[PDB]
Every structure is written in C-alpha cells, then in structure tokens.
C-alpha cells in the first residue's frame, strides 16, 4: 500500500508543470462511478481547474475501489536531471589515474582517445546492458534524498552518508554532463566522445552501492570502492575479495551443524581450533599489502582490526567486504585479450577414462534405449541446447536471422543438408565462433560456438553420465536433490582436532593448455572401452560419434575478433560450449584431486573422510592418526602445492582445519556463508528480456542479495520499478501501473508488497482483476504461426514423431509444436513484434474490461475457497535451532530458528512417479509435469494407449493401468504440479523445513475422509499461512480446519483444472 502512495511523491517530484488516478472495481455501480470520476478529472485538468472538489465527490472511489494506474500529463523534456544534479555538483570531480590498468583500454581514458573516430567506437567494453537509464538512476537517487533530507537521529546519518557519496557521483558527472541514452538504452559515440569512457557503468555501480549503505562501515566501503573503481577497473574486485579465502581458515568453530545418517543438518557442539602455519599468515599479509599498494586504506585496515581477535562474532564485516567487492561492475575486456591468457598425466588421465566408463558401463552392455536412440533425444533436447551462429534461413517464402540451434535442424532437414552422422570439423578449415561469460573480479573466459551436430552427439551420453553423478556424493553439485546446505554439513561433519581440510580453486587448470590432451584422451579412451562392450549398431554409432567430438576438438581453431576485423588464431586449451562441459569438467576436476591426494600420501598417512567436486573447486577432509600441528598443515600444504605445480597447473591450493572457501559458498566459523554481490544496475549481457521483465528480474536480484547479505534500500528498488514499468501512450503522457497491477499474482507480476511474502487474490477486486489479466496473457505472433505453416516445420515435427509414435499420439504431438512456438519468439522479429503489440493491448486493458468469459481456475481460485474454513488462533513457538546462515534477515532467520531448515529440494516435476519411470524405461520422450498432470487426469482406457503410443510394452502397460501404484501416482503428479505453482522450491521458502515437527503442530486438520488430494492442499495452505504470518509478525498462529465433507468434492474437481502464469523473472532460486 505504501508503494502506490510513494509513487505519487516520485511523480510530483519529477513533474512540476497533472496526475489523473484511475480506479477500477468488480462492483458494477462503483465502476460507473469510477468512470464518471475519471472523465470529470480529465476535463477539469484540460481546463486548468482544481480537483479537490472532485476527490471529495468520489470518496467512495478513493476509499472503496482499486487504483489501476496513475496517468501523467507532462510537457517539459525530461531534462530535469541536468538542473537537479547541479545542486549536488559542489564536490570536486574525480581524476582517474590512467596509469593503473595493465591493459590500456581497461584504463578510464577519454573516449575520444580509446576511439578517435565514430566507426571505431564500441560500447562493447562498458555497456551497462540494462534497459534503464543513467539519468533515471540519478533521478531516482535524487528523489530519495529530497524525501529523506529531514530524517532525524540514525536515519539522518544514513542520509549524510548517502548525501556525501552521491556528491562524488554528481560532481564528476556534472563536469561532463549527464550522458543521454537512446531508445535502445545504449550509449552512442557522440555523447560518449568527450567523456571518460567508463563513466556510465561506473555511475551505475556507484549509485547501486551508495544506495546500499546504512552503517558507517557501509559508507567507508561504498566510499573506497566507489573512488578506486573510477580509475582501477581490473583488479579492485579481485584484490578486495582475495583475502577472504585465507580468513576462513583463521576462525575456530564453537558449535556447528553437521550431516547425520539421515542426511539432515544436525546441530553439533563440537569445537575445533583454527590452527594456521606461520607462512600462511604471510600469504595473508601480502594480500593486505597488495590491497594497500593499490590505493586501498580503510578496507585493509578493517581486516587488520579483525585479525587481532578473529572473533566470528565480528565476522559479519569481513563478509560485507567480500560481497561488496562484486558490486564494482563487470570486467569486460576485449575478446582477444580474454582469449590470450590461455608423462605425469598417466595417473590423471587414467582416472578420467575410468570414471567415464563407470558412468556408462551398465547402460552400454544392456544396450540402453537412450544410447540406441541418442539422435532423437538430442534432437528433442535442442530446446535446452546451447547456441550457434545466427545463420540465415528461409521458411515458406521469407527470410530470417535465427540463432537458435533447433531451427537450424529444421532448415537442414528440409534441405537434405541435415547430416548428423557427419559432425563438422572444428579446425583451420571450419573454425569455432566465440561466445563469452563475464564475472566481477575474474579474467574473462571464452565460450566455443560449436554447431548442432555436437550437441546431438553429446546429449544422451552426458544425460546418462549425470544419472551416475546423481547418486554419487563426490559430485556435490549433482547428488540427489541436495541443496547447498547438505554440502555445508558434510564438511563440518568430520572436522576434528585430528583432521585438516583442503580446498582448491582449479578454475585456471580447467583451461590450461596442458589439460586438454589428458582430458580428451581420457574421454576418448573410455569410449573405446565401452565400444568393446556392445554389438549394438545404434549404441556403437553413438559411442563412436562422441569420440570424434573429442578428436575434432584436439586441434581447434578460434574465430577470434580483433577490432572491426575477425582474426583467426589457434587454440590448444579447452573451453565451455559442449554438453559434456559441466559434467565432463567435474569428472576431470575430481580426477585431478584424486591424483594429487594419492601422491601426497606417499609422505604422510591420513584417511580420506570425504572428497568432493563443485565446478571450479574441489575439496577433501583427511584424518590423521595424531593431533594436527601447525607444522603438519604447513607441510601438507607445501606437498600439495608442489604436486599441483609438478603437473604444471595454476591453482589456489589452501588448507585449514575449520573452514573452506570456494566459488559458491564459504564456511567461516563453522557457519555457512554465501556471497551477495549481484550487480543490480549493470547487467552482464544484453539478452532478449523486456523492460518489464527487466524490472521483475531486478527485484528478483534484490531479494537474493538481501537474503545473502548485501541490501539495496527497498525504496530505491520501488523507484526503479516505477521507472521501468511505466509506459507512454503519447509523447507527453506516461502511464504508471499501480501496486495492485504490479504485485497481483499474474504473468506480469513484478514483485511483492512485502518481501519474502507472496499474496493471493482474497478480495473480489483482486480476483476480478486476476481473471481479467489472464485474458491478454498470450497474444499470437504474426510470425510464430506462419513458421509452423511451412513444409519445414511440418516435416520436422512429423519427422521427429514418425520415429516416436505408433498410435494416435496427438496429445504428444500438440505439445511438441508449442514447445517450439514457445521459444520461437526469441527471434527479434517475434519477441519485438509480440512485445510492441502487447503494449497496445496492455494500455487498452487498463482502460475498460468488464467483458470476460472466465471459466478457467487457478491457485488463486482454489485457495480463495479454502480460506473461510480455516480458524486462526494465537499460538506460540520457541526458538530452538541455532544460526548457521548469519546473513539471513531477522524475519527470515526467525522461521529457521523455530521450525528449522531442509537440505533437500521438493520434487516439483513428477520425476519421481511410477508412470514417469515407465515412460522413461522404454521411450526416450520426456513429458513435463503439465503433461503428466493432464495425462494422469485421464481415464484408465486413454492412459493405456498413451503408454503404448510411446512404446511401453502392453503386458507392462496394462499392469500399471490397473495396479494400486497408478492410483498413488495420481496423487504424486498433483503434488509436484501444486508445489511447482507455489514456487516452494525457489524464493525464501526453499530454506524452510515445510515438514518441520514444530510447524506441523501449529496446524490442526481432521480427516473427514482419506482423500489425499484435499487433505494435502488444506495442509499446505495451512503451512504457508502460518509461515507468512511469522514473517510479517514475528509471532505464530495456529490454524484449525473443519472443512465439510460436501465441500471437499467440489474442491476436488477444481484441483484438476488449474492453469499457470509464466513470468520467469520471479526466479529467486539461488542455492
């Protein structure tokens, strides 16, 4: 509710020259009243008359109706920024020490210097890539200051800090003026030509950080990073963070949580003295010195103060620094520079091959259908395939520039060009294009761009590999539904005064030219061993083709650009872009640690308690037949590093007894920590999202950060959403959508009216509007249909089906078509056509509805029904579980303190149902949860044919149709579908133990009848309600349910008719 009013301040603030609110309502009489009020308002304003009398004359509308949006009639130029900024340009502009960046262009020179001519300029090195403007950020920041220019006490101090800092930004920007952004939110050459090239991105990062300060320390930190970043743009993030790895080893462990036999976090009182060798301390001093010799002052001092007592109680600060260092921006260097950085392997490669074999040993001999029909599966998977060059195409009688790999298959099949048995050579003749991945505080890494023959020859094998990983704990990333918490508990588990932990950072090793030979040799060798295990042509064909991918790779040239020209150099290193990348990479990393660990054993005798891999990090807790001495840790670390050295591999091999740090999570003090640095006002790359989705994505990012540590002031975020959602109907009239429009659960929902809490239509208006929004949810694309009209699409679908179907498969057939018609929009002409057209419908939609033939039901309709049958009464819950994720906001942390947390994901795809397993056991097809949901809701007779249509044997198909297991399977499919619709696995809920004994007691539900469906929803609805109350009140409530037996049947029908609401931005899923 505060969002709608706040928006008024923002509009009045920006415009000084009318504001015509717009109210809608389910009530019919009120609605006409709303229209009268609206009509009179325009007339009064377009006649320069008051509006105070009208508002009094429509108190019913203000008080009883819903605000739909607020129109804004303006007539200036939106150049209020130039005028407002000057008041803050009092400070002295910053001067960048152009003598800081090893790479010339990394230095913050004058654009006209880095790019003398227009045809030479390229924002490719600083592009915020975000659909919001710098002026907007400046405008948004100014609005907050105007509003909090009179706050008192501590609130004021936040202002003084915010005021000070902002001045650095205002003062510097003012010197060169505020850069103007074009429709594409890019920054052209003329505006940029006389300004410090890295200005715009810097302002975003400085603004993002200064609007994230609260305590004094935040200020020094925001202040130091803000200033040094202006000149340093290549080591500030790396330097500020770097010491965090050594710091974790420093603090002891006073009580920590572990992983018990039931693989659930269990509080242990164990104590472990964090003992570190002398040399390790020096390593940390150098990190501090490097930080110091680089300009830093206060931040280094802080860590220094921390090291005097190294009290986990004062560790929170060390965390704020490591998280903050990331908000300095993205290191976007020239592609070539990024590309440029790139006998005793018998033991190493041997393990890689062997691991490959195990993952594919049983499947190969049996002649798994997946291996035999690998071509269809890979073909089907294309939707979840990488990306290829934006080729040229023709379908029917037109031309397009699609970059999606799946479409390439369509053009090629309908052109006799499709030839998967022949995987294009990736060398001098036909080199590999290039893609990239940027990340704060790390050298840019490149991404191959192999054709589709490569994905196809890699999907089945990798998929089969993963299943093995899925049940192997060594691969801490894949194992079961495991969440990061399980991984956290496993490490603390064996930690004792007779066991030292060892972590590494093999990121560079995965791209070390040295690595490619072994890596490829092992994969190929294993394929050879597997091939001499079967006599199946389909499998051997697949086993062989995969082998070739490695051979073509062994010698791969790269189409590396070097200006407006495309050079072409060699490349003896391995990069990402293959299916096997993430999976195979782990195999190698695991293979590497096994090799190093075994070799070091020659000297000291230990016991490998646990070994794990996780992308660019691999660790292990080894136990010693005696107490660990500083000398011992120093010796083992040396032996480990030298070993890594012998294999000529750049790595960060550290060793501790109580903590570990890695790219995804750091365990300092026996407590689990997560970094919180997701740049909010500077995106990595310019995707295909829209301004609206950009905002919902921004809010998602904000919540993840708040949950992890970093916290950008929510008022600022509200301001951005206000700027990002608004849309103009004229050149002097913008339409700012209301809070109800913005937060109501729909396909346009951007945020929540209370972070961490999701609401659902409870009032008539919310539902009235809720049903109304679904209407214009999916608007056809005058391209996505014609594409399915050409022989190409029809041949491709039929061609895929002809080898997938037998009977009348159309339920399956209808889905495949939309499977493509759902991604096809990607193609600019379709995403842009749909996005631009949506605005006309959306603008008109706010105008006048009242005419909708609703009939479809959703979670909103179902939940609204159950509400009246729940009787709430104050209940009490004591805090018993300790803390292990110290950064969690108090309200969130409180729930875990009372009901606990889970170290698992809640099955939300039906993957663990008997029917699914059967469909998988024989057919390669993979029906989504939605399909399983629709299929399960069918009659026994229909369901039986579905299985046959895919290939399940009739004896077996018939057994399922009757069997008791099928009935239960009907319950499980619904459960997965429901949980999916509640995002119970994403957001903050993924951190709550929804089966907590403590939470369960607070719910009271009598079994009117053994009806698993209804009993299930009443309970989950009961649990969500209690949790949400907890978050928004700090106190608990107990719910009672007396749902009549009659009502249950009506509700039961509703359960199998719930539709969805797409919006992917809501994505908060972080661990």
Phi first, then psi, for residue 487 (nearest 5°) are -60, -40
Q: What element of type H or E holds 673?
A: strand 671-673
The residue assigned the tokens 């909090």 is: 148
How do beta strands 435-437 and 499-503 pair? Answer: unpaired
Give which of 412, 399, 400 is closest to 451, Cα–Cα. 412
Question: What's the rounded Cα separation, in Å, for the pair 488 and 885?
Answer: 11
H-state helical runs in 867-983: 890-899, 914-922, 929-936, 940-950, 954-962, 964-981
Gyration radius of the chain over CA positions: 30
Complete DSSP assignment for 1038-1070? EEEE---HHHHHHHHHHHTTB------TT----
Long-range contacts of 181-189 (CB under 8 A, 24+ apart): 181/133, 181/134, 181/135, 185/128, 185/130, 185/131, 185/132, 185/133, 186/123, 186/127, 187/123, 187/126, 187/127, 188/123, 189/111, 189/115, 189/118, 189/121
Q: What element of type H or E holds 287?
A: helix 278-292
Question: What's the rounded Cα separation, in Å, for the pair 304 and 903?
Answer: 35
Beta bridge partners of residue 620, listed in sequence order: 502, 611
The answer to whether 534 touches 361, Cβ cutoff 8 Å, is no
The residue assigned the tokens 């200051």 is: 145
C-alpha distances (whole Å) from 1061 to each of 747, 772, 785, 848, 983 are 5, 13, 22, 22, 12
The answer to whether 1027 touches 895, Cβ cutoff 8 Å, is yes
Question: What's the rounded Cα separation, in Å, for the pair 689 and 1065?
Answer: 9
Question: What's the rounded Cα separation, in Å, for the pair 910 and 928?
Answer: 8
The 10 Å Cβ neighbour count of residue 752 is 17
Give the rounded distance of the alpha carbon of 771 from its chain centre. 29
Query: Which string of b and e fits 585-620 if b means at least 16 CB within 10 Å?
Result: bbbbbbbbbbbbbebbeeeeebeebbbbbbbbbbbb
Torsion angle of C-alpha atoms 1015, 1017, 1018, 1021, degrees rounded to 10: 160
32 CB-near residues (< 8 Å, 6+ apart): none
The 10 Å Cβ neighbour count of residue 462 is 21
Give which of 860, 858, 899, 908 is closest to 1003, Cα–Cα. 899
998 CB-near residues (< 8 Å, 6+ apart): 877, 880, 898, 899, 900
3-class secondary structure, 37: helix
C-alpha distances (whole Å) from 104 to each of 100, 109, 112, 195 are 9, 9, 14, 17
Question: What's the rounded Cα separation, in Å, for the pair 241 and 258?
Answer: 27
Phi first, then psi, for residue 100 (nearest 5°) are -130, -30
Beta bridge partners of residue 802, listed in sequence order: none
The answer to whether 1009 touches 1045, Cβ cutoff 8 Å, is yes
Question: What's the rounded Cα separation, in Å, for the pair 222 and 710?
Answer: 12
Beta bridge partners of residue 173, listed in sequence order: none
The answer to whether 746 touches 712, Cβ cutoff 8 Å, is no
Tokens read off for 443: 């050298």
Beta bridge partners of residue 667, listed in sequence order: 660, 672
Question: What's the rounded Cα separation, in Å, for the pair 981 and 1059?
Answer: 9
The 10 Å Cβ neighbour count of residue 142 is 20
Question: What's the rounded Cα separation, in Å, for the pair 600 and 621?
Answer: 14
Question: What's the rounded Cα separation, in Å, for the pair 346 and 648?
Answer: 14
Query: Which string of b and e fits 981-1010 if b means at least 16 CB within 10 Å?
Result: bbbbbbbbbbbbbbebebbeebbbeeebee
Complete DSSP assignment for 869-888? GEEEEEE-----S--S-TTS
Give which of 949, 656, 642, 1009 is closest to 805, Cα–Cα. 949
Question: What's the rounded Cα separation, in Å, for the pair 584 and 355?
Answer: 10
Tokens read off for 177: 């003026």
The residue assigned the tokens 């791969």 is: 556
Phi first, then psi, for residue 538 (nearest 5°) are -60, -45
Question: What's the rounded Cα separation, in Å, for the pair 916 and 1062?
Answer: 23
- Identify how the structure was determined: X-ray
SS (H, E, C) 147-203: HCCCCCHHHHHHHHHHHHHHHHHHHHHHHHCCCCCCCCCCCCHHHHCCCECCHHHHH
The answer to whether 740 touches 766, Cβ cutoff 8 Å, is yes
3-class secondary structure, 98: coil
Query: Which string of b and e fits 517-542 if b means at least 16 CB within 10 Å?
Result: ebbbbbbbbbbebbbebbebebbbbb
Question: What's the rounded Cα separation, in Å, for the pair 169 and 374?
Answer: 56
Question: What's the rounded Cα separation, in Å, for the pair 1020 and 760?
Answer: 14
C-alpha distances (whole Å) from 1040 to each of 685, 859, 1021, 1051 are 50, 21, 12, 18
Tokens read off for 669: 């003090």
The vertex-927 CA angle with 926 and 928, nearest 5°, equals 115
Tokens read off for 545: 């083709």
Tokens read off for 154: 């501590």
C-alpha distances (whole Å) from 622 to each of 242, 617, 653 are 25, 17, 15
* Resolution of the experimentally solved model in angstroms: 3.3
Give which of 315, 152, 149 is closest to 247, Cα–Cα. 315
The residue assigned the tokens 């939605």 is: 930
Complete DSSP assignment for 552-575? HHHS--B--B-SSSB--B---S--
The answer to whether 34 touches 769, Cβ cutoff 8 Å, is no
The 10 Å Cβ neighbour count of residue 392 is 10
How do beta strands 660-661 and 265-272 pair? Answer: unpaired
Phi first, then psi, for residue 1044 (nearest 5°) are -55, 155
Give which of 139, 147, 199 is closest to 173, Cα–Cα. 199
The residue assigned the tokens 């082998």 is: 547
626 CB-near residues (< 8 Å, 6+ apart): 498
Question: What's the rounded Cα separation, in Å, for the pair 129 and 694?
Answer: 11
3-class secondary structure, 83: helix
3-class secondary structure, 654: strand
Breaks (C-N over 2.5 A) in the chain follow: 17, 342
The 10 Å Cβ neighbour count of residue 499 is 17
Q: Terminal CA-to-CA distance of the chain, rounded, Å?
A: 31
Question: What's the rounded Cα separation, in Å, for the pair 971 and 888?
Answer: 35
The answer to whether 199 touches 260, Cβ cutoff 8 Å, is no
The residue assigned the tokens 């300060």 is: 213
The answer to whether 1071 touches 484, Cβ cutoff 8 Å, is yes
> In 11-51, where do the E strands start and end?
19-24
Q: What percent of the residues of the chain are helix, what percent strand, and what percent coil, each to the nearest 5?
A: 50, 10, 40
SS (H, E, C) 437-469: ECCCCCCCEEECCCCHHHHHHHHHHHHHHHHHH
Tokens read off for 350: 């041997």
Instruction: Let me know how long the chain is.
Output: 1071
The 10 Å Cβ neighbour count of residue 545 is 22
Question: What's the rounded Cα separation, in Å, for the pair 667 and 783?
Answer: 51
Give the rounded distance of the alpha carbon of 220 from its chain centre. 30
- Domains of the chain as residue ranges with CATH: 1-79+683-751+1060-1071 (no CATH), 80-232 (1.20.120.1390), 233-250+276-333 (1.10.10.1990), 251-275+476-505+581-682 (3.30.70.2480), 334-382+424-475+506-580 (1.10.357.80), 383-423+752-853 (no CATH), 854-906+993-1059 (3.30.230.140), 907-992 (1.20.120.1400)
Indicate the DSSP class of residue 974: H
Q: What element of type H or E holds 500?
A: strand 499-503
Question: What's the rounded Cα separation, in Å, for the pair 450 and 571?
Answer: 14
Give which of 962, 972, 916, 964 is closest to 939, Cα–Cα. 962
The answer to whether 288 touches 647, Cβ cutoff 8 Å, is no
3-class secondary structure, 576: strand
The 10 Å Cβ neighbour count of residue 566 is 12
824 CB-near residues (< 8 Å, 6+ apart): 404, 407, 781, 783, 784, 787, 830
The 10 Å Cβ neighbour count of residue 795 is 14
Phi first, then psi, for residue 610 (nearest 5°) are -145, 145
Query: Which string of b and e fits 940-955 if b means at least 16 CB within 10 Å?
Result: eeebbbbbebbbbeee
Strand order in the sheet with 1036-1041: 870-875, 1036-1041, 1003-1004
């Amino acid at each position: 509710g505060k969002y709608n009013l706040i928006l008024s301040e923002y509009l009045s603030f920006i415009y000084n020259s009318v504001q015509i609110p717009i109210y809608y309502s389910s009530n019919s009489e009120l609605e006409n009243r709303c229209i009268e009020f609206h009509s009179k308002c325009l007339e009064n304003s377009k006649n320069g008359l008051s509006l105070r009398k009208l508002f009094v004359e429509y108190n019913d509308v203000i008080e009883n109706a819903t605000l739909l949006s607020i129109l804004s009639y303006s007539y200036d130029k939106y150049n209020a920024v130039e005028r407002k900024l000057v008041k803050y340009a009092k400070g002295k502009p910053l001067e960048a020490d152009l003598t800081v960046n090893e790479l010339d262009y990394e230095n913050n020179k004058m654009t006209s210097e880095l790019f003398p001519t227009a045809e030479e300029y390229t924002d490719s090195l600083m592009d915020p890539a975000i659909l919001t403007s710098l002026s907007s950020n400046l405008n948004a920041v100014m609005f907050w200051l105007e509003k909090h220019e009179n706050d008192v006490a501590e609130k004021l101090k936040v202002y003084k800090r915010r005021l000070d800092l902002f001045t650095i930004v205002a003062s510097t920007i003012n010197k060169y003026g505020v850069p103007r952004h074009n429709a594409k939110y890019r920054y052209e050459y003329d505006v940029m030509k006389d300004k410090p090239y890295y200005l715009v991105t810097w302002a975003n990062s400085s603004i993002e950080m200064l609007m994230s300060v609260f305590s004094h320390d935040d200020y020094l930190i925001a202040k130091e990073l803000i200033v040094l970043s202006y000149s340093n743009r290549s080591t500030l993030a790396k330097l500020v963070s770097s010491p965090m790895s050594i710091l974790v080893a420093l603090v002891d462990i006073n009580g920590t949580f572990i992983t018990n036999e039931e693989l659930e976090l269990e509080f242990s009182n164990k104590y472990v003295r964090a003992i570190v060798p002398d040399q390790t301390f020096d390593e940390l001093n150098q990190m501090l010195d490097n930080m110091r010799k680089a300009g830093l002052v206060d931040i280094p001092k802080m860590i220094q103060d921390w090291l005097v007592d190294r009290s986990i109680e004062k560790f929170p600060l060390m965390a704020k620094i490591y998280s903050w260092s990331f908000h300095v921006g993205f290191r976007k260097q020239k592609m070539l520079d990024a590309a440029l950085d790139q006998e005793m392997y018998r033991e190493y490669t041997m393990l890689i091959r062997d691991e490959v074999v195990k993952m594919l040993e049983e499947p190969v001999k049996h002649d798994d259908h997946l291996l035999r029909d690998s071509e269809l599966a890979g073909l089907l998977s294309m939707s979840s395939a990488s990306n290829g060059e934006s080729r040229q195409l023709k379908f029917g009688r037109k031309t397009i520039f699609s970059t999606k790999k799946n479409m390439h298959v369509m053009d090629d099949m309908a052109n006799e060009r499709y030839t998967p048995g022949i995987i294009p050579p990736v060398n001098v003749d036909k080199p590999i294009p290039l893609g990239r991945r940027d990340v704060p505080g790390r050298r840019t890494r490149i991404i191959f761009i192999l054709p589709y023959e490569y994905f196809i020859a890699q999907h089945a094998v990798v998929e089969k590999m993963l299943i093995y990983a899925k049940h192997t704990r060594e691969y801490a990333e894949f194992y079961s539904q495991s969440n990061q918490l399980l991984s956290y508990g496993d490490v603390t588990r064996f930690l004792s005064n007779n066991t030292m932990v060892l972590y590494t950072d093999v990121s560079q090793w995965d791209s070390s030219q040295h690595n490619t030979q072994p890596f490829r040799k092992g994969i190929i060798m294993g394929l050879d061993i597997l091939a001499n295990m079967t006599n199946d042509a389909k499998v051997l064909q697949t086993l062989n083709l995969y082998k070739q991918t490695q051979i073509n790779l062994m010698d791969s040239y790269v189409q590396i650009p070097d200006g407006n020209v495309i050079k072409k150099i060699q490349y003896g290193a391995v990069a990402s872009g293959e299916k096997q990348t993430k999976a195979a990479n782990s195999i190698a990393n695991l293979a590497l640690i096994k090799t190093v660990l075994s070799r070091i054993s020659n000297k000291h005798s230990f016991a490998t308690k646990i070994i794990r891999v996780d992308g660019d990090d691999n660790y292990a807790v080894l136990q010693f037949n005696t107490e660990v001495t500083k000398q011992m840790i120093q010796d083992v670390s040396n032996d480990v590093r030298e070993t890594y050295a012998r294999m000529n591999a750049k790595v960060k091999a550290l060793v501790s007894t109580v903590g570990i740090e890695i790219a995804k999570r750091y365990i300092a003090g026996g407590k689990i920590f997560f970094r919180a640095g997701i740049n909010l006002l500077n995106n990595e790359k310019r995707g295909q999202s829209t301004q609206w989705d950009q905002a919902a994505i921004l809010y998602s990012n904000y919540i993840v950060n708040r949950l992890r540590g970093f916290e950008t002031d929510r008022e600022f975020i509200l301001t951005k959403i206000m700027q990002m959602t608004s849309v103009a109907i004229t050149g002097s009239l913008r339409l700012f959508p209301s809070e109800r429009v913005l937060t109501t659960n729909s396909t346009f929902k951007v945020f929540d009216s209370e972070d961490f809490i999701i609401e659902y239509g409870t009032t008539v208006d919310e539902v009235y509007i809720q049903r109304a929004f679904m209407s214009l949810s999916s608007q056809k694309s005058g391209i996505a249909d014609e594409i399915a009209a050409s022989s190409t699409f029809k041949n491709y679908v039929t061609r895929l089906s002809e080898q997938l179907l037998f009977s009348k498969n159309n339920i399956v057939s209808r889905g495949i078509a939309l499977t493509e018609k759902a991604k096809l929009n990607s193609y600019a002409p379709i995403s842009l056509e749909k996005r631009r057209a949506q605005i006309s419908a959306l603008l008109t939609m706010l105008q006048k509805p009242v005419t909708f033939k609703s009939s479809k039901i959703t979670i909103n309709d179902i939940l609204r029904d159950i509400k009246p049958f729940f009787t709430v009464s104050d209940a009490h819950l004591p805090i018993q579980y300790q803390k292990f994720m110290p950064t969690l906001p108090d309200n969130v942390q409180y729930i875990i303190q009372c009901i606990g947390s889970r170290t698992y994901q809640i099955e939300d795809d039906g993957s663990k149902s008997a029917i699914s397993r059967l469909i998988s056991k024989y057919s390669v097809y993979k029906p989504s949860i939605e399909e399983l949901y629709k299929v399960i809701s069918l009659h026994e007779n229909e369901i039986q044919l579905y299985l046959i249509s895919l290939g399940i044997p009739k004896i077996d198909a018939d057994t399922y149709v009757g069997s008791k297991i099928y009935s239960r399977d009907k319950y499980r499919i619904l459960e997965s579908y429901v949980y999916n619709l509640l995002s119970i696995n994403y957001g903050c809920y993924q951190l709550f133990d929804f089966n907590s004994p403590d939470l369960e007691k607070l719910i009271r539900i009598p079994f009117k009848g053994k009806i698993p469906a209804v009993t299930f929803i009443l309970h989950l609805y009961a649990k969500l309600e209690v949790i949400n109350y907890a978050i928004k009140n700090g106190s608990w409530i107990s719910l009672f349910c007396n749902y009549p037996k009659s009502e249950m049947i009506k509700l039961w029908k509703k359960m199998w008719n719930i539709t969805s609401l797409r919006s992917p931005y809501t994505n908060a899923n972080f661990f």
